[PDB]
Amino acid sequence: NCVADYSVLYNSASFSTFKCYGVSPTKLNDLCFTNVYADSFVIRGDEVRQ
Amino acid sequence: SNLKPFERDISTEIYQAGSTPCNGVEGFNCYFPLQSYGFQPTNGVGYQP
């Protein structure tokens, strides 16, 4: 029951995202989705393909 | 953006990934489109050419 705005990744710094961006890449913010459940985990990130 | 099926894009223009203009020269938010794999004999299981 929220907004789930994407103002955080507008400017950002580097990053790679999920590399799909099906609708409006780098714009998004057009679909509501059920929730923004974000599990807590940290990885090295070099093996981003896996 | 993604390509139409059976396309061949040989453009070498620089990328402007942000609001900062690139003016056709490398810099912040200005990354070259082409990168080389660098194939060498001792590569991984799924890294050979």
Could you tell me where the beta strands, DSSP code E, fall in chain A? Answer: none
> Cα(B22)–Cα(B14) distance, rounded to whole angstroms?
8
Q: What is the resolution of this structure in A?
A: 3.7
The closest alpha carbon to B15, from B34, B32, B27, belongs to: B32
> Cα(B1)–Cα(B21) distance, rounded to whole angstroms?
19
> Cα(A45)–Cα(A40) distance, rounded to whole angstroms?
15
DSSP A47: T
What value, to the nearest 5°, has the Cα angle with vertex B37 and ends B35 and B43? 160
> Cα(B31)–Cα(A41) distance, rounded to whole angstroms?
30
The closest alpha carbon to A8, from A25, A21, A23, A26, belongs to: A26
DSSP A30: -
Residues B14 and B32: beta-carbon distance below 8 Å: yes
